[PDB]
Amino acid sequence: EMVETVCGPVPVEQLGKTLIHEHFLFGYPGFQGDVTRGTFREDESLRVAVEAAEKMKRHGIQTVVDPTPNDCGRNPAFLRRVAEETGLNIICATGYPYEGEGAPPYFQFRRLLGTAEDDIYDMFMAELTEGIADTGIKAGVIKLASSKGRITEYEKMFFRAAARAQKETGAVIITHTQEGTMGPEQAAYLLEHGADPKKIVIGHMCGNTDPDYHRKTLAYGVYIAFDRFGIQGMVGAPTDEERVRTLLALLRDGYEKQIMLSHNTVNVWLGRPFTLPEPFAEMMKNWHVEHLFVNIIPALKNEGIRDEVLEQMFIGNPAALFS
Protein backbone atom coordinates (compact mmCIF):
# COMPACT_ATOMS: atom_id res chain seq x y z
CA GLU A 1 0.00 0.00 0.00
CA MET A 2 3.01 2.28 0.62
CA VAL A 3 6.36 2.42 -1.18
CA GLU A 4 9.54 4.01 0.15
CA THR A 5 10.62 7.04 -1.87
CA VAL A 6 13.47 9.51 -1.37
CA CYS A 7 10.82 11.51 0.51
CA GLY A 8 9.60 8.63 2.65
CA PRO A 9 6.53 6.41 2.26
CA VAL A 10 4.11 7.33 -0.53
CA PRO A 11 0.82 5.47 -1.18
CA VAL A 12 1.13 3.32 -4.27
CA GLU A 13 -2.27 4.65 -5.38
CA GLN A 14 -0.65 8.10 -5.67
CA LEU A 15 2.39 7.16 -7.77
CA GLY A 16 0.49 7.96 -10.93
CA LYS A 17 2.20 8.20 -14.29
CA THR A 18 5.61 6.61 -13.79
CA LEU A 19 8.87 6.31 -15.70
CA ILE A 20 10.32 2.99 -14.56
CA HIS A 21 14.02 3.52 -15.34
CA GLU A 22 15.84 6.87 -15.50
CA HIS A 23 19.05 8.04 -13.87
CA PHE A 24 19.42 11.52 -12.46
CA LEU A 25 23.12 10.80 -11.80
CA PHE A 26 25.21 7.94 -13.14
CA GLY A 27 28.90 7.18 -13.30
CA TYR A 28 30.64 4.12 -14.65
CA PRO A 29 32.52 2.31 -11.85
CA GLY A 30 36.00 3.80 -11.82
CA PHE A 31 34.71 7.36 -12.06
CA GLN A 32 35.65 7.80 -8.39
CA GLY A 33 39.38 7.76 -9.15
CA ASP A 34 39.02 10.64 -11.61
CA VAL A 35 37.94 13.04 -8.87
CA THR A 36 40.50 15.71 -9.72
CA ARG A 37 39.34 16.32 -13.32
CA GLY A 38 35.84 14.97 -12.75
CA THR A 39 34.58 16.61 -9.59
CA PHE A 40 30.90 16.35 -8.80
CA ARG A 41 29.40 19.81 -9.45
CA GLU A 42 26.52 19.81 -6.96
CA ASP A 43 24.73 23.09 -7.76
CA GLU A 44 24.82 22.61 -11.54
CA SER A 45 23.93 18.89 -11.32
CA LEU A 46 20.93 19.82 -9.17
CA ARG A 47 19.68 22.44 -11.65
CA VAL A 48 19.99 19.98 -14.59
CA ALA A 49 18.38 17.25 -12.49
CA VAL A 50 15.58 19.56 -11.42
CA GLU A 51 15.08 20.62 -15.03
CA ALA A 52 14.85 16.99 -16.16
CA ALA A 53 12.28 16.57 -13.40
CA GLU A 54 10.32 19.57 -14.72
CA LYS A 55 10.33 18.29 -18.32
CA MET A 56 9.01 14.91 -17.16
CA LYS A 57 6.38 16.76 -15.14
CA ARG A 58 5.16 18.58 -18.25
CA HIS A 59 4.25 15.20 -19.78
CA GLY A 60 2.32 14.11 -16.67
CA ILE A 61 5.04 12.11 -14.91
CA GLN A 62 4.60 12.05 -11.13
CA THR A 63 7.02 9.23 -10.24
CA VAL A 64 10.49 8.18 -11.45
CA VAL A 65 12.26 4.98 -10.48
CA ASP A 66 16.02 5.73 -10.45
CA PRO A 67 17.84 2.39 -10.30
CA THR A 68 21.38 3.70 -10.16
CA PRO A 69 23.52 0.92 -8.62
CA ASN A 70 25.19 1.57 -5.29
CA ASP A 71 28.71 2.17 -6.60
CA CYS A 72 27.57 4.05 -9.74
CA GLY A 73 26.84 7.39 -8.14
CA ARG A 74 23.58 6.63 -6.28
CA ASN A 75 23.00 9.68 -4.07
CA PRO A 76 19.75 9.43 -2.09
CA ALA A 77 20.14 12.80 -0.38
CA PHE A 78 20.70 14.36 -3.81
CA LEU A 79 17.59 12.73 -5.20
CA ARG A 80 15.67 14.00 -2.18
CA ARG A 81 16.74 17.56 -3.04
CA VAL A 82 15.36 16.98 -6.54
CA ALA A 83 12.12 15.56 -5.13
CA GLU A 84 11.65 18.20 -2.41
CA GLU A 85 12.17 20.93 -5.04
CA THR A 86 9.92 19.52 -7.80
CA GLY A 87 7.33 17.40 -5.98
CA LEU A 88 8.30 14.39 -8.08
CA ASN A 89 8.22 11.01 -6.34
CA ILE A 90 11.61 9.35 -6.79
CA ILE A 91 12.21 5.74 -5.81
CA CYS A 92 15.81 4.58 -5.59
CA ALA A 93 17.48 1.16 -5.65
CA THR A 94 19.83 -1.07 -3.74
CA GLY A 95 22.00 -3.14 -6.02
CA TYR A 96 25.20 -3.58 -7.89
CA PRO A 97 26.05 -3.44 -11.62
CA TYR A 98 26.82 -6.48 -13.76
CA GLU A 99 30.39 -7.77 -13.92
CA GLY A 100 31.08 -6.31 -17.37
CA GLU A 101 30.52 -2.70 -16.27
CA GLY A 102 31.12 -3.10 -12.57
CA ALA A 103 33.74 -3.29 -9.84
CA PRO A 104 33.44 -6.93 -8.67
CA PRO A 105 36.69 -7.03 -6.58
CA TYR A 106 35.01 -6.02 -3.30
CA PHE A 107 32.40 -8.75 -3.34
CA GLN A 108 34.61 -11.25 -5.16
CA PHE A 109 36.92 -11.00 -2.16
CA ARG A 110 34.02 -11.58 0.18
CA ARG A 111 33.01 -14.60 -1.93
CA LEU A 112 36.49 -15.97 -1.20
CA LEU A 113 35.71 -15.61 2.51
CA GLY A 114 32.32 -17.27 2.10
CA THR A 115 30.20 -14.32 3.28
CA ALA A 116 29.37 -12.50 0.01
CA GLU A 117 25.81 -13.69 -0.62
CA ASP A 118 24.85 -13.15 3.01
CA ASP A 119 26.58 -9.76 3.04
CA ILE A 120 24.60 -8.71 -0.05
CA TYR A 121 21.40 -9.92 1.61
CA ASP A 122 22.30 -7.82 4.70
CA MET A 123 22.89 -4.72 2.55
CA PHE A 124 19.66 -5.28 0.64
CA MET A 125 17.71 -5.69 3.88
CA ALA A 126 19.36 -2.68 5.54
CA GLU A 127 18.70 -0.34 2.65
CA LEU A 128 15.16 -1.60 2.11
CA THR A 129 14.03 -1.52 5.74
CA GLU A 130 16.35 0.83 7.70
CA GLY A 131 17.98 3.28 5.32
CA ILE A 132 20.84 4.04 2.99
CA ALA A 133 23.93 5.26 4.93
CA ASP A 134 22.72 8.09 7.23
CA THR A 135 20.31 9.57 4.66
CA GLY A 136 17.16 8.15 6.24
CA ILE A 137 16.11 7.07 2.72
CA LYS A 138 15.08 3.47 1.98
CA ALA A 139 15.45 1.99 -1.49
CA GLY A 140 12.11 0.99 -2.94
CA VAL A 141 13.60 -1.46 -5.43
CA ILE A 142 16.33 -4.06 -5.67
CA LYS A 143 18.42 -3.58 -8.83
CA LEU A 144 19.97 -6.66 -10.49
CA ALA A 145 22.10 -6.95 -13.63
CA SER A 146 23.56 -9.72 -15.69
CA SER A 147 26.31 -9.97 -18.28
CA LYS A 148 25.96 -10.60 -22.02
CA GLY A 149 24.95 -14.21 -22.67
CA ARG A 150 25.64 -15.22 -19.08
CA ILE A 151 24.47 -14.66 -15.52
CA THR A 152 27.89 -15.02 -13.96
CA GLU A 153 28.54 -16.82 -10.69
CA TYR A 154 29.28 -13.43 -9.14
CA GLU A 155 26.03 -11.95 -10.48
CA LYS A 156 24.12 -15.03 -9.28
CA MET A 157 25.05 -14.08 -5.68
CA PHE A 158 23.06 -10.88 -6.04
CA PHE A 159 20.17 -12.68 -7.69
CA ARG A 160 19.84 -15.16 -4.83
CA ALA A 161 20.27 -12.41 -2.22
CA ALA A 162 17.56 -10.42 -4.02
CA ALA A 163 15.17 -13.36 -3.98
CA ARG A 164 15.78 -13.88 -0.25
CA ALA A 165 15.25 -10.18 0.51
CA GLN A 166 12.13 -10.12 -1.69
CA LYS A 167 10.65 -13.05 0.21
CA GLU A 168 11.19 -11.17 3.47
CA THR A 169 10.24 -7.65 2.35
CA GLY A 170 8.05 -7.93 -0.71
CA ALA A 171 10.35 -5.51 -2.51
CA VAL A 172 10.14 -4.98 -6.26
CA ILE A 173 13.09 -6.32 -8.28
CA ILE A 174 14.22 -4.36 -11.35
CA THR A 175 16.85 -5.90 -13.58
CA HIS A 176 19.29 -4.88 -16.31
CA THR A 177 19.82 -7.30 -19.22
CA GLN A 178 22.90 -6.87 -21.39
CA GLU A 179 22.53 -6.56 -25.17
CA GLY A 180 19.20 -8.40 -25.33
CA THR A 181 20.33 -11.61 -23.63
CA MET A 182 19.22 -13.56 -20.51
CA GLY A 183 15.69 -12.21 -20.07
CA PRO A 184 14.16 -15.67 -19.80
CA GLU A 185 17.17 -16.85 -17.85
CA GLN A 186 16.77 -14.06 -15.28
CA ALA A 187 13.07 -14.80 -14.75
CA ALA A 188 13.56 -18.54 -14.44
CA TYR A 189 16.46 -18.12 -12.01
CA LEU A 190 14.67 -15.58 -9.82
CA LEU A 191 11.63 -17.88 -9.79
CA GLU A 192 13.84 -20.90 -9.01
CA HIS A 193 14.80 -19.09 -5.83
CA GLY A 194 11.27 -18.17 -4.83
CA ALA A 195 10.96 -14.63 -6.20
CA ASP A 196 7.49 -13.38 -7.11
CA PRO A 197 6.99 -12.70 -10.84
CA LYS A 198 4.45 -10.01 -10.06
CA LYS A 199 7.27 -8.11 -8.31
CA ILE A 200 9.93 -8.48 -11.04
CA VAL A 201 10.75 -6.16 -13.96
CA ILE A 202 13.12 -7.67 -16.51
CA GLY A 203 14.80 -4.61 -17.98
CA HIS A 204 16.40 -3.52 -21.25
CA MET A 205 14.19 -6.04 -22.98
CA CYS A 206 14.05 -3.64 -25.94
CA GLY A 207 17.61 -4.81 -26.50
CA ASN A 208 16.16 -7.84 -28.28
CA THR A 209 14.05 -7.55 -31.43
CA ASP A 210 12.61 -11.07 -31.58
CA PRO A 211 9.09 -11.09 -30.08
CA ASP A 212 9.57 -14.82 -29.39
CA TYR A 213 12.32 -13.94 -26.90
CA HIS A 214 9.97 -11.44 -25.28
CA ARG A 215 7.18 -13.98 -25.11
CA LYS A 216 9.51 -16.50 -23.49
CA THR A 217 10.17 -13.89 -20.79
CA LEU A 218 6.55 -12.75 -20.43
CA ALA A 219 5.60 -16.43 -20.02
CA TYR A 220 7.07 -16.25 -16.50
CA GLY A 221 4.43 -13.67 -15.50
CA VAL A 222 7.08 -11.00 -14.92
CA TYR A 223 7.04 -7.46 -16.27
CA ILE A 224 9.43 -6.46 -19.04
CA ALA A 225 10.70 -2.94 -19.65
CA PHE A 226 11.33 -1.34 -23.03
CA ASP A 227 13.44 1.09 -21.06
CA ARG A 228 16.17 2.39 -23.42
CA PHE A 229 14.19 4.44 -25.96
CA GLY A 230 16.51 6.93 -27.64
CA ILE A 231 19.65 4.81 -27.22
CA GLN A 232 20.61 3.98 -30.83
CA GLY A 233 23.79 2.75 -32.48
CA MET A 234 25.79 2.22 -29.23
CA VAL A 235 27.00 -1.04 -27.56
CA GLY A 236 24.63 -3.42 -29.44
CA ALA A 237 21.44 -1.37 -28.95
CA PRO A 238 18.98 -1.51 -31.91
CA THR A 239 17.02 1.41 -33.32
CA ASP A 240 13.88 3.00 -31.88
CA GLU A 241 12.15 1.76 -35.03
CA GLU A 242 12.87 -1.85 -34.08
CA ARG A 243 11.92 -1.16 -30.46
CA VAL A 244 8.55 0.15 -31.69
CA ARG A 245 8.06 -2.74 -34.15
CA THR A 246 8.79 -5.19 -31.34
CA LEU A 247 6.51 -3.40 -28.87
CA LEU A 248 3.63 -3.09 -31.34
CA ALA A 249 3.76 -6.85 -31.89
CA LEU A 250 3.58 -7.43 -28.13
CA LEU A 251 0.73 -4.94 -27.71
CA ARG A 252 -1.31 -6.43 -30.56
CA ASP A 253 -0.89 -9.77 -28.73
CA GLY A 254 -2.46 -8.23 -25.61
CA TYR A 255 0.61 -8.07 -23.34
CA GLU A 256 0.15 -4.47 -22.18
CA LYS A 257 -0.39 -5.40 -18.50
CA GLN A 258 3.19 -6.70 -18.50
CA ILE A 259 5.04 -3.89 -20.35
CA MET A 260 6.54 -0.64 -19.07
CA LEU A 261 8.53 1.94 -21.01
CA SER A 262 11.45 4.24 -20.18
CA HIS A 263 14.55 5.90 -21.67
CA ASN A 264 17.30 4.97 -19.17
CA THR A 265 18.57 8.56 -19.36
CA VAL A 266 21.76 9.69 -17.65
CA ASN A 267 20.89 13.30 -16.95
CA VAL A 268 24.19 14.07 -15.21
CA TRP A 269 27.24 11.93 -15.96
CA LEU A 270 29.61 11.56 -13.03
CA GLY A 271 33.32 11.96 -13.62
CA ARG A 272 34.88 13.94 -16.44
CA PRO A 273 32.64 15.29 -19.23
CA PHE A 274 32.80 13.79 -22.70
CA THR A 275 31.38 14.24 -26.19
CA LEU A 276 30.35 11.51 -28.56
CA PRO A 277 31.30 11.70 -32.24
CA GLU A 278 28.29 12.96 -34.19
CA PRO A 279 27.89 9.61 -35.99
CA PHE A 280 26.94 8.37 -32.53
CA ALA A 281 25.98 11.79 -31.16
CA GLU A 282 23.31 12.46 -33.79
CA MET A 283 21.90 8.96 -33.44
CA MET A 284 21.86 9.34 -29.65
CA LYS A 285 20.20 12.74 -30.10
CA ASN A 286 16.73 11.69 -28.91
CA TRP A 287 18.05 10.20 -25.64
CA HIS A 288 16.24 12.57 -23.30
CA VAL A 289 13.38 12.33 -20.83
CA GLU A 290 10.85 13.82 -23.27
CA HIS A 291 11.49 11.38 -26.14
CA LEU A 292 8.79 8.85 -25.24
CA PHE A 293 6.19 11.61 -25.10
CA VAL A 294 7.31 13.80 -28.04
CA ASN A 295 8.43 11.16 -30.60
CA ILE A 296 7.50 7.60 -29.58
CA ILE A 297 4.02 7.65 -27.99
CA PRO A 298 2.42 9.75 -30.80
CA ALA A 299 3.83 7.28 -33.36
CA LEU A 300 2.26 4.47 -31.34
CA LYS A 301 -1.07 6.33 -31.29
CA ASN A 302 -0.82 6.60 -35.09
CA GLU A 303 -0.34 2.82 -35.33
CA GLY A 304 -3.49 1.86 -33.41
CA ILE A 305 -2.50 2.09 -29.77
CA ARG A 306 -5.29 3.53 -27.62
CA ASP A 307 -5.04 5.82 -24.60
CA GLU A 308 -6.23 3.10 -22.23
CA VAL A 309 -3.32 0.90 -23.32
CA LEU A 310 -0.83 3.71 -22.65
CA GLU A 311 -2.42 4.36 -19.23
CA GLN A 312 -2.09 0.65 -18.39
CA MET A 313 1.64 0.80 -19.12
CA PHE A 314 2.41 4.16 -17.54
CA ILE A 315 -0.03 4.12 -14.63
CA GLY A 316 -1.63 0.73 -14.09
CA ASN A 317 1.51 -1.40 -14.28
CA PRO A 318 3.56 0.66 -11.76
CA ALA A 319 0.56 0.70 -9.45
CA ALA A 320 0.23 -3.07 -9.75
CA LEU A 321 4.00 -3.55 -9.54
CA PHE A 322 4.40 -1.84 -6.19
CA SER A 323 1.25 -3.08 -4.46
Handedness of CA 278, 248, 223, 80 (dihedral sign): positive
Check if the beta carbon of residue 220 is closer than 8 Å to that of residue 257. Answer: no
Applying CB under 6 A, which of residues 181, 246, 264, 265 lies at the interface with ligand [O-]? Answer: 264
Q: Name the residue nearer to Zn ion (CB basis): 176 or 199.
A: 176
Q: Is 75 in the site for ligand [O-] (CB under 6 A)?
A: no
Smallest Cα–Cα separation from 287: which of 248, 249, 239?
239
Partner that binds at residue 176, options ligand [O-], ligand LAE, a copy of itself, none, CB closer than 5 to 8 Å by kind? ligand [O-]
Check if the beta carbon of residue 203 is closer than 8 Å to that of residue 177. Answer: yes
Q: Is 143 in the site for ligand [O-] (CB under 6 A)?
A: no
Q: Name the residue nearer to ligand [O-] (CB basis): 68 or 217.
A: 68
Q: Name the residue nearer to a copy of itself (CB basis): 133 or 299.
A: 133
C-alpha to C-alpha distance for 204 and 206, rounded to whole angstroms: 5
- Contact code string over 167-206 relative to Zn ion, x by CB under 5 A: ---------x------------------------------
Applying CB under 8 A, which of residues 66, 117, 127, 227 lies at the interface with a copy of itself? Answer: 127
Of residues 271-290, which lie at the interface with ligand LAE (CB under 6 A)?
A: 276, 284, 287
Smallest Cα–Cα separation from 224: which of 209, 195, 204, 251?
204
Applying CB under 6 A, which of residues 35, 77, 133, 234 lies at the interface with ligand LAE? Answer: 234
Burial of 32 (0-12, 13-18, 19+ CB in 10 A): middle
Check if the beta carbon of residue 231 is closer than 8 Å to that of residue 284. Answer: yes
**In the complex, which residues of this chain contact Fe ion (CB under 5 A)?**
264
